[PDB]
Amino acid sequence: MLLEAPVYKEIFGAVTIHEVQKVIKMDTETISNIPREKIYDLLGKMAVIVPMKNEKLHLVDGVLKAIPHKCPIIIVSNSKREGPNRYKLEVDLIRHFYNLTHSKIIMIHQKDPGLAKAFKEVGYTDILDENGMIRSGKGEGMLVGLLLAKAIGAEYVGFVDADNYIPGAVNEYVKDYAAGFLMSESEYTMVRLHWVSEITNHYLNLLVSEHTAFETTIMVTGNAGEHAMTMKLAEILPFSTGYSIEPYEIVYILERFGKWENVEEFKDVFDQGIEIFQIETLNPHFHEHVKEMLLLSLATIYHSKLATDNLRKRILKDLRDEEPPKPLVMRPIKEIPIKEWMDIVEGNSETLLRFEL
Amino acid sequence: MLLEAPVYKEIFGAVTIHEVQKVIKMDTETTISNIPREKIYDLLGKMAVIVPMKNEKLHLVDGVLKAIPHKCPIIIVSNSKREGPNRYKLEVDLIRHFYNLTHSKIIMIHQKDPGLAKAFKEVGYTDILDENGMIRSGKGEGMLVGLLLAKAIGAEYVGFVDADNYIPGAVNEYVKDYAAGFLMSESEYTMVRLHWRVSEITNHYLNLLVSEHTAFETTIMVTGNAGEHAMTMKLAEILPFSTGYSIEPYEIVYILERFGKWENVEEFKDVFDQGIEIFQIETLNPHFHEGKEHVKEMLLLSLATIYHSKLATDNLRKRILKDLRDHGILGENEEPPKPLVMRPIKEIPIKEWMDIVEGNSETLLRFEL
């Protein structure tokens, strides 16, 4: 692959946000050259997590068929389990798919009681609802996929949505993730793909412009659902849910590493730095309350130890023209004895499906 | 890559039409056919990807170019405007910028290049020029030029792609699906046609063109308007080509009437010996490209190709005249235009033809090719 070289960028404390780069050429033997083979090497160390809930089976099928064989696939379904039992429909698709491709894949249902059991017996209750079960939501699904990914030794994790109309785009996202990591110089790296979102980008940059003093545009992937991170970085990040996930990752990262403090708490991170790559894909986005998305994204910014007295004012008046709801946040999953957690997920979960993984 | 294995198929004389196959898995090294990623990249280097274009949007052309595997040489035959404003000029700029950023091996020429029309005359091949003696405007002619250029650089396979695709990634899959079709082939004379309601009518009559002789209805043919297709140079080289919307269906009609049965086998003894294989691959990506007058100009011409086939029967004939009228595109008493057909470019001396293009064409552009 060929991409524009990473030239321009801005720094905030220990955070480096690279200017968006374009993919210049897809298949390859001011321009970065990431050989196709270095990408396939990294691919084998990247878990592609797919949190899903009632998506169209023909779309899920295409996304699955597009993920590079090399990549382990982790599916966390919070699909409807009755009248009709759709998890059941997905289980069937997954095995047919495995029978035709031998892809390495793990699938589990979010409501698996053997899953909720591992979280408690391990002390991690941040992901449970009042009925003692894992709360429905996208962040929780991502958290489960994340731990599963850690349990199999993944070094990188990429997120992909199962309702893409363009399988080829999914194939490019994964490769673009790899490309982002291969151009990184830090073990704490995030890759966010790019092709409302501007209002989120407008305020995220503003979140910063208000103490650098200079208006910026550098941030352009604030609602980037298609993103990837190294396991090291994912594991120390508190996660939100719903539409707050993407913008919140950015807000938290600046909040905690935008200045230098408690450097002792996260030594290696402050020293190695956090890099955020923003790659503009070659393919367009096509998939299938803009008001909630919009309110939750901005709520993420309005509520930080870093939003100014004035920044909040505009958001407010922008939203109105009664404050924004504080976003649900779950603690990092780093201090979870992954093995113990996995042992009891394996010995108690009734929906876990393993195929050569 | 993984594909459903070729199991079902039908034969007609020396023609083997394989049942449509689906791509089951995209990236692979490892009822199912396994064509390792690497065998595909080897073939890729011997395949010229021909892109006949005419006034397409620059940003779409740019994406298509960026998606073609670096290893594939690219041949562009532009018949774009030359003033008000000169957009061949805009394309030349895009192509150089592209070349400076990627070092892709590429050749581009304008269809109206007088140094191009000169090579065709001095070589005896007049089928492609009009009165003025210039190369006629049209997609088949563009394809013919790209085809000879491809032959001039030693391409063994040629794949056709349209420059107005909205999905770069799909173009990237087409080229790979072409290779896959060729790698599952057992004949040097192979065609690969991609697949994903005008084509259902063309497919209906194409199969009917055959069912009328076998007496058994078939649905084997499902890529009658497959713009995305590819062939071995050996096969492309001996085929008469039409133009406009008749190109794709006509390739099928001609292959069926010349090899649909043994005869004058001496004229093409090697072809009859190895047979012609037609693979039909269903892509993983959908089809989303850049009118409606066109769609039923497409209907009118696809069907005319069949109607004028020496394989047609009076029955298939009135059924076509009829379907065609019931739609309001053919008068109640006029029979469909006959198609335009130039002949195989096999007897053109490629070497002395290329010398004339190289030494006389003011629009020819080359980058490591």
Short mmCIF file of C-alpha atoms in Angstrom, two decimals, chain B:
data_model
loop_
_atom_site.label_atom_id
_atom_site.label_comp_id
_atom_site.label_asym_id
_atom_site.label_seq_id
_atom_site.Cartn_x
_atom_site.Cartn_y
_atom_site.Cartn_z
CA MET B 1 -9.06 -16.16 -2.44
CA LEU B 2 -11.77 -18.85 -2.13
CA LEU B 3 -14.56 -19.46 -4.61
CA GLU B 4 -17.27 -22.05 -4.95
CA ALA B 5 -15.75 -24.83 -7.06
CA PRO B 6 -16.74 -25.18 -10.71
CA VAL B 7 -19.02 -28.17 -10.72
CA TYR B 8 -22.00 -27.53 -12.99
CA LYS B 9 -21.68 -26.34 -16.59
CA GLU B 10 -22.99 -26.80 -20.08
CA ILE B 11 -21.30 -27.45 -23.36
CA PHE B 12 -22.19 -26.28 -26.86
CA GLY B 13 -19.92 -27.62 -29.52
CA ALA B 14 -16.49 -26.46 -28.38
CA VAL B 15 -17.90 -23.91 -25.93
CA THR B 16 -17.96 -24.56 -22.20
CA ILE B 17 -20.08 -22.17 -20.17
CA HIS B 18 -19.46 -22.68 -16.46
CA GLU B 19 -22.21 -22.07 -13.96
CA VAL B 20 -21.85 -18.83 -12.00
CA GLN B 21 -19.48 -19.15 -9.02
CA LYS B 22 -19.35 -17.06 -5.91
CA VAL B 23 -16.32 -15.55 -4.23
CA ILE B 24 -16.40 -17.12 -0.77
CA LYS B 25 -13.40 -15.46 0.88
CA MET B 26 -11.25 -12.55 -0.27
CA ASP B 27 -7.72 -12.72 1.21
CA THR B 28 -6.20 -16.19 1.23
CA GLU B 29 -2.77 -17.84 1.08
CA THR B 30 -3.79 -21.19 2.57
CA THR B 31 -17.06 -27.69 -3.19
CA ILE B 32 -14.56 -24.89 -2.62
CA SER B 33 -11.77 -23.72 -4.92
CA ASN B 34 -8.66 -22.27 -3.32
CA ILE B 35 -6.72 -19.92 -5.57
CA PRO B 36 -3.80 -18.76 -3.40
CA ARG B 37 -3.25 -15.01 -3.26
CA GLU B 38 0.21 -15.47 -4.75
CA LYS B 39 -0.77 -17.39 -7.86
CA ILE B 40 -3.13 -14.46 -8.55
CA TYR B 41 -0.34 -11.87 -8.25
CA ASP B 42 1.82 -13.79 -10.67
CA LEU B 43 -0.88 -13.76 -13.30
CA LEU B 44 -1.63 -10.14 -12.52
CA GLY B 45 1.73 -9.09 -13.96
CA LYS B 46 0.76 -10.53 -17.32
CA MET B 47 -2.62 -8.86 -17.47
CA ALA B 48 -3.18 -5.52 -19.07
CA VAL B 49 -6.15 -3.70 -17.50
CA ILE B 50 -7.76 -1.74 -20.29
CA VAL B 51 -9.80 1.31 -19.40
CA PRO B 52 -11.74 2.81 -22.40
CA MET B 53 -12.92 6.20 -21.17
CA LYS B 54 -14.81 9.26 -22.30
CA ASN B 55 -15.43 12.39 -20.19
CA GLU B 56 -15.67 10.56 -16.86
CA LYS B 57 -15.29 12.48 -13.64
CA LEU B 58 -11.68 12.90 -12.62
CA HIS B 59 -12.13 11.94 -8.98
CA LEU B 60 -13.74 8.64 -10.01
CA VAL B 61 -11.03 7.85 -12.57
CA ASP B 62 -8.52 8.65 -9.85
CA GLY B 63 -10.05 6.12 -7.48
CA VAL B 64 -10.22 3.40 -10.06
CA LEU B 65 -6.53 3.94 -10.93
CA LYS B 66 -5.56 3.85 -7.27
CA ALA B 67 -7.34 0.49 -6.84
CA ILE B 68 -5.75 -1.39 -9.73
CA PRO B 69 -3.01 -3.72 -8.41
CA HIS B 70 0.38 -2.01 -8.89
CA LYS B 71 1.59 -5.07 -10.74
CA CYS B 72 -0.99 -4.71 -13.54
CA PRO B 73 0.00 -2.55 -16.49
CA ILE B 74 -2.73 0.01 -17.22
CA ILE B 75 -3.87 0.96 -20.69
CA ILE B 76 -6.17 3.97 -21.02
CA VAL B 77 -7.90 4.80 -24.28
CA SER B 78 -9.55 8.19 -23.87
CA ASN B 79 -12.08 9.58 -26.29
CA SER B 80 -12.72 12.62 -24.15
CA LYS B 81 -13.29 16.17 -25.28
CA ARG B 82 -10.43 18.04 -26.87
CA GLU B 83 -11.72 21.57 -26.34
CA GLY B 84 -14.23 23.72 -24.57
CA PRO B 85 -12.39 22.53 -22.62
CA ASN B 86 -9.66 20.10 -23.71
CA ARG B 87 -10.29 17.41 -21.08
CA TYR B 88 -7.85 14.88 -22.49
CA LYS B 89 -5.49 17.51 -21.17
CA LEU B 90 -7.08 17.29 -17.71
CA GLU B 91 -6.65 13.53 -17.86
CA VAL B 92 -3.01 13.79 -18.92
CA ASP B 93 -2.42 15.89 -15.80
CA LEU B 94 -4.18 13.46 -13.51
CA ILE B 95 -2.24 10.58 -15.05
CA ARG B 96 1.16 12.21 -14.47
CA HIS B 97 0.33 13.24 -10.92
CA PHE B 98 -0.81 9.69 -10.40
CA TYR B 99 2.37 8.36 -11.93
CA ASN B 100 4.55 10.64 -9.80
CA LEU B 101 2.84 9.39 -6.63
CA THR B 102 2.65 5.70 -7.55
CA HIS B 103 5.01 4.76 -10.41
CA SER B 104 2.27 2.65 -11.89
CA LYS B 105 3.12 1.31 -15.34
CA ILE B 106 0.77 3.06 -17.68
CA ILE B 107 0.05 3.90 -21.32
CA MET B 108 -2.59 6.39 -22.41
CA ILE B 109 -3.58 7.61 -25.85
CA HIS B 110 -6.47 9.56 -27.25
CA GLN B 111 -8.75 7.68 -29.64
CA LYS B 112 -8.74 10.57 -32.15
CA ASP B 113 -4.96 10.64 -32.37
CA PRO B 114 -4.30 10.96 -36.12
CA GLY B 115 -1.08 8.99 -35.69
CA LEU B 116 -3.33 6.22 -34.51
CA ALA B 117 -5.67 6.29 -37.48
CA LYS B 118 -2.56 6.26 -39.66
CA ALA B 119 -1.30 2.95 -38.28
CA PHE B 120 -4.62 1.25 -38.97
CA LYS B 121 -4.65 2.33 -42.62
CA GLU B 122 -1.09 1.63 -43.55
CA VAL B 123 -1.65 -1.81 -42.04
CA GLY B 124 -4.81 -2.53 -44.03
CA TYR B 125 -7.20 -2.52 -41.09
CA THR B 126 -9.98 -0.11 -42.15
CA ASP B 127 -12.83 -1.56 -40.04
CA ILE B 128 -12.30 1.02 -37.30
CA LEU B 129 -12.21 4.29 -39.26
CA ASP B 130 -15.07 6.40 -40.70
CA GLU B 131 -15.02 8.45 -43.94
CA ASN B 132 -12.64 11.19 -42.90
CA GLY B 133 -10.38 8.23 -42.15
CA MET B 134 -10.26 8.90 -38.42
CA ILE B 135 -10.84 6.30 -35.73
CA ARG B 136 -14.57 6.25 -35.15
CA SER B 137 -15.92 7.32 -31.78
CA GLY B 138 -17.17 4.35 -29.76
CA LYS B 139 -16.35 1.90 -26.97
CA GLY B 140 -15.53 -1.08 -29.14
CA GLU B 141 -12.96 0.91 -31.11
CA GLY B 142 -11.46 2.14 -27.85
CA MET B 143 -11.27 -1.46 -26.71
CA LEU B 144 -9.63 -2.46 -29.98
CA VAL B 145 -6.94 0.16 -29.58
CA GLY B 146 -6.30 -0.87 -26.00
CA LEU B 147 -6.22 -4.43 -27.13
CA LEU B 148 -3.50 -3.87 -29.77
CA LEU B 149 -1.52 -1.76 -27.35
CA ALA B 150 -1.84 -4.59 -24.87
CA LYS B 151 -0.56 -6.98 -27.49
CA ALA B 152 2.30 -4.59 -28.29
CA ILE B 153 3.58 -4.80 -24.68
CA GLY B 154 3.23 -8.56 -24.49
CA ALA B 155 0.13 -8.86 -22.33
CA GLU B 156 -1.11 -12.43 -22.11
CA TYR B 157 -4.45 -11.48 -20.54
CA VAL B 158 -6.61 -8.38 -20.82
CA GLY B 159 -9.22 -7.21 -18.35
CA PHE B 160 -11.75 -4.43 -18.97
CA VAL B 161 -12.74 -1.99 -16.27
CA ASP B 162 -14.95 1.10 -16.32
CA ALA B 163 -13.45 4.32 -14.96
CA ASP B 164 -16.68 5.56 -13.37
CA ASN B 165 -16.98 3.05 -10.53
CA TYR B 166 -17.85 4.58 -7.17
CA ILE B 167 -16.17 1.69 -5.37
CA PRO B 168 -12.39 1.55 -5.95
CA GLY B 169 -12.30 -1.63 -3.93
CA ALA B 170 -14.65 -3.31 -6.39
CA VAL B 171 -12.23 -2.58 -9.23
CA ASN B 172 -9.53 -4.13 -7.15
CA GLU B 173 -11.67 -7.25 -6.78
CA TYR B 174 -12.57 -7.41 -10.46
CA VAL B 175 -8.96 -7.72 -11.52
CA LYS B 176 -8.36 -10.39 -8.91
CA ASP B 177 -11.58 -12.20 -9.90
CA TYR B 178 -10.36 -12.17 -13.51
CA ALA B 179 -7.11 -13.86 -12.48
CA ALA B 180 -9.12 -16.36 -10.47
CA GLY B 181 -11.20 -17.23 -13.49
CA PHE B 182 -8.09 -17.73 -15.61
CA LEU B 183 -6.34 -19.82 -12.90
CA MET B 184 -9.29 -22.23 -12.77
CA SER B 185 -9.24 -22.53 -16.53
CA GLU B 186 -7.86 -25.50 -18.47
CA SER B 187 -7.76 -23.67 -21.83
CA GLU B 188 -5.63 -20.95 -23.41
CA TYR B 189 -8.91 -19.60 -24.84
CA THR B 190 -10.71 -18.33 -21.75
CA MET B 191 -13.12 -15.56 -20.88
CA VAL B 192 -14.12 -14.39 -17.41
CA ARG B 193 -17.27 -12.35 -16.92
CA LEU B 194 -18.26 -10.76 -13.61
CA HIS B 195 -21.70 -10.81 -12.08
CA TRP B 196 -23.62 -9.17 -9.22
CA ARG B 197 -33.40 -5.79 -15.09
CA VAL B 198 -32.01 -5.17 -18.59
CA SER B 199 -29.43 -7.96 -18.22
CA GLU B 200 -32.16 -10.39 -17.20
CA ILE B 201 -33.84 -9.87 -20.58
CA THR B 202 -30.53 -10.23 -22.42
CA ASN B 203 -29.78 -13.31 -20.34
CA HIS B 204 -33.24 -14.63 -21.01
CA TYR B 205 -32.80 -14.42 -24.82
CA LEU B 206 -29.18 -15.57 -24.85
CA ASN B 207 -30.12 -18.79 -23.11
CA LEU B 208 -33.18 -18.99 -25.36
CA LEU B 209 -30.88 -18.60 -28.36
CA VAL B 210 -29.54 -21.95 -27.20
CA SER B 211 -32.61 -23.60 -25.75
CA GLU B 212 -34.11 -23.25 -29.29
CA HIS B 213 -31.49 -25.73 -30.52
CA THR B 214 -31.02 -28.06 -27.54
CA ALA B 215 -34.77 -28.07 -26.78
CA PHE B 216 -33.95 -27.73 -23.09
CA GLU B 217 -34.43 -24.43 -21.31
CA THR B 218 -31.27 -23.20 -19.66
CA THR B 219 -30.31 -20.34 -17.25
CA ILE B 220 -26.59 -21.11 -17.49
CA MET B 221 -25.81 -17.70 -19.01
CA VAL B 222 -26.10 -14.85 -16.49
CA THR B 223 -23.49 -12.26 -17.61
CA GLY B 224 -24.75 -11.15 -21.03
CA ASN B 225 -24.17 -7.47 -20.34
CA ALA B 226 -21.10 -8.03 -18.20
CA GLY B 227 -19.01 -4.93 -18.87
CA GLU B 228 -16.50 -6.20 -16.36
CA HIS B 229 -14.88 -9.07 -18.21
CA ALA B 230 -11.53 -10.39 -19.24
CA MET B 231 -10.00 -12.73 -21.82
CA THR B 232 -6.73 -14.39 -22.77
CA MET B 233 -4.98 -12.47 -25.58
CA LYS B 234 -5.30 -15.59 -27.70
CA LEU B 235 -9.06 -15.43 -27.51
CA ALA B 236 -9.47 -11.66 -27.76
CA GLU B 237 -7.21 -11.70 -30.82
CA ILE B 238 -9.57 -13.84 -32.91
CA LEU B 239 -12.85 -12.23 -31.99
CA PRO B 240 -14.81 -9.82 -34.16
CA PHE B 241 -15.84 -6.91 -31.93
CA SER B 242 -18.97 -4.77 -32.03
CA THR B 243 -19.43 -1.46 -30.22
CA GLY B 244 -21.83 0.45 -28.01
CA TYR B 245 -24.12 -1.75 -25.90
CA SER B 246 -23.75 -4.67 -28.30
CA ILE B 247 -20.18 -5.52 -27.27
CA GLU B 248 -20.86 -7.84 -24.35
CA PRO B 249 -23.84 -9.77 -25.67
CA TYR B 250 -22.24 -9.98 -29.09
CA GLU B 251 -19.11 -11.70 -27.73
CA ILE B 252 -21.42 -14.49 -26.52
CA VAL B 253 -23.50 -14.69 -29.71
CA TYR B 254 -20.44 -14.89 -31.93
CA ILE B 255 -18.64 -17.44 -29.79
CA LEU B 256 -21.80 -19.56 -29.89
CA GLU B 257 -22.27 -19.40 -33.64
CA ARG B 258 -18.64 -19.98 -34.59
CA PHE B 259 -17.73 -22.68 -32.10
CA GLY B 260 -21.19 -23.74 -30.91
CA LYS B 261 -20.49 -26.56 -33.37
CA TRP B 262 -17.79 -28.33 -35.25
CA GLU B 263 -17.15 -26.96 -38.74
CA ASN B 264 -14.29 -25.34 -40.67
CA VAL B 265 -12.36 -26.63 -37.72
CA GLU B 266 -9.24 -26.05 -39.85
CA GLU B 267 -9.75 -22.30 -39.75
CA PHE B 268 -9.42 -22.48 -35.93
CA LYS B 269 -8.05 -25.97 -35.29
CA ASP B 270 -6.27 -25.07 -32.05
CA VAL B 271 -9.39 -23.35 -30.67
CA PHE B 272 -11.55 -26.41 -31.43
CA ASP B 273 -8.83 -28.54 -29.92
CA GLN B 274 -8.63 -26.77 -26.55
CA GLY B 275 -12.15 -25.36 -26.55
CA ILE B 276 -13.37 -22.01 -25.31
CA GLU B 277 -14.16 -21.71 -21.59
CA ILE B 278 -16.33 -18.96 -20.17
CA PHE B 279 -16.20 -18.45 -16.41
CA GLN B 280 -18.88 -16.44 -14.64
CA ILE B 281 -17.84 -15.08 -11.27
CA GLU B 282 -20.23 -13.37 -8.89
CA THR B 283 -18.35 -10.60 -7.13
CA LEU B 284 -18.44 -9.93 -3.45
CA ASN B 285 -18.95 -6.17 -3.91
CA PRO B 286 -22.13 -4.66 -5.33
CA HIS B 287 -22.34 -2.77 -8.64
CA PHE B 288 -22.59 1.00 -8.12
CA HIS B 289 -21.55 3.13 -11.08
CA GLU B 290 -22.25 6.60 -12.41
CA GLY B 291 -29.44 7.75 -17.69
CA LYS B 292 -32.60 5.93 -18.88
CA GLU B 293 -32.60 6.68 -22.58
CA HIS B 294 -29.37 4.73 -22.44
CA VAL B 295 -30.85 1.75 -20.53
CA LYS B 296 -33.26 1.00 -23.32
CA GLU B 297 -30.72 1.80 -26.08
CA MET B 298 -28.90 -0.90 -24.13
CA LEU B 299 -32.00 -3.06 -24.39
CA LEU B 300 -32.47 -2.30 -28.06
CA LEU B 301 -28.87 -3.13 -28.94
CA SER B 302 -28.35 -6.15 -26.68
CA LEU B 303 -31.38 -7.82 -28.23
CA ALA B 304 -30.49 -6.88 -31.77
CA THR B 305 -27.24 -8.77 -31.43
CA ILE B 306 -29.22 -11.97 -30.82
CA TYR B 307 -32.01 -11.25 -33.30
CA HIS B 308 -29.49 -11.02 -36.15
CA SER B 309 -27.64 -14.16 -35.12
CA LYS B 310 -27.58 -16.97 -37.64
CA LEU B 311 -28.51 -19.13 -34.64
CA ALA B 312 -31.79 -17.29 -34.22
CA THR B 313 -35.07 -18.92 -35.23
CA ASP B 314 -38.23 -17.25 -36.50
CA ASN B 315 -39.74 -17.99 -33.10
CA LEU B 316 -36.97 -16.41 -31.04
CA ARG B 317 -37.19 -13.62 -33.57
CA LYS B 318 -40.78 -12.55 -33.17
CA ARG B 319 -40.45 -12.99 -29.45
CA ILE B 320 -37.63 -10.39 -29.53
CA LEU B 321 -39.36 -8.00 -31.97
CA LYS B 322 -42.38 -8.38 -29.71
CA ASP B 323 -40.76 -7.95 -26.27
CA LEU B 324 -38.87 -5.03 -27.83
CA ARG B 325 -42.08 -3.33 -29.09
CA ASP B 326 -44.16 -4.07 -26.02
CA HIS B 327 -41.56 -1.80 -24.39
CA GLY B 328 -41.81 1.04 -26.92
CA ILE B 329 -38.27 1.11 -28.27
CA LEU B 330 -38.80 -0.55 -31.62
CA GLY B 331 -41.40 0.69 -34.09
CA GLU B 332 -44.26 -1.67 -34.86
CA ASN B 333 -42.90 -2.55 -38.26
CA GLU B 334 -39.15 -1.82 -38.12
CA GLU B 335 -36.69 -4.58 -37.35
CA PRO B 336 -33.77 -3.78 -34.95
CA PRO B 337 -30.57 -2.20 -36.27
CA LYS B 338 -27.94 -4.74 -37.21
CA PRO B 339 -24.80 -4.49 -35.19
CA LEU B 340 -21.53 -2.88 -36.20
CA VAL B 341 -18.74 -5.46 -36.39
CA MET B 342 -15.03 -5.09 -36.93
CA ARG B 343 -13.01 -8.26 -37.24
CA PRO B 344 -10.33 -10.01 -35.25
CA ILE B 345 -7.19 -7.95 -35.02
CA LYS B 346 -5.14 -11.10 -35.28
CA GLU B 347 -3.77 -10.47 -38.77
CA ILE B 348 -2.62 -6.92 -38.05
CA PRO B 349 1.16 -7.00 -37.95
CA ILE B 350 1.49 -5.77 -34.41
CA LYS B 351 5.11 -4.71 -34.83
CA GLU B 352 4.78 -2.49 -37.87
CA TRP B 353 1.47 -1.17 -36.44
CA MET B 354 3.09 -0.12 -33.20
CA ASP B 355 6.00 1.52 -35.02
CA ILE B 356 3.48 3.74 -36.78
CA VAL B 357 1.69 4.66 -33.55
CA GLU B 358 4.95 5.30 -31.66
CA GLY B 359 6.36 7.41 -34.41
CA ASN B 360 3.27 9.41 -35.31
CA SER B 361 0.88 9.81 -32.41
CA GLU B 362 0.90 13.18 -30.65
CA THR B 363 -1.16 11.96 -27.68
CA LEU B 364 0.65 8.75 -26.74
CA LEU B 365 1.93 8.82 -23.13
CA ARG B 366 4.19 6.32 -21.43
CA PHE B 367 5.46 5.63 -17.92
CA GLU B 368 7.61 2.52 -17.43
CA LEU B 369 5.53 0.87 -20.14
#
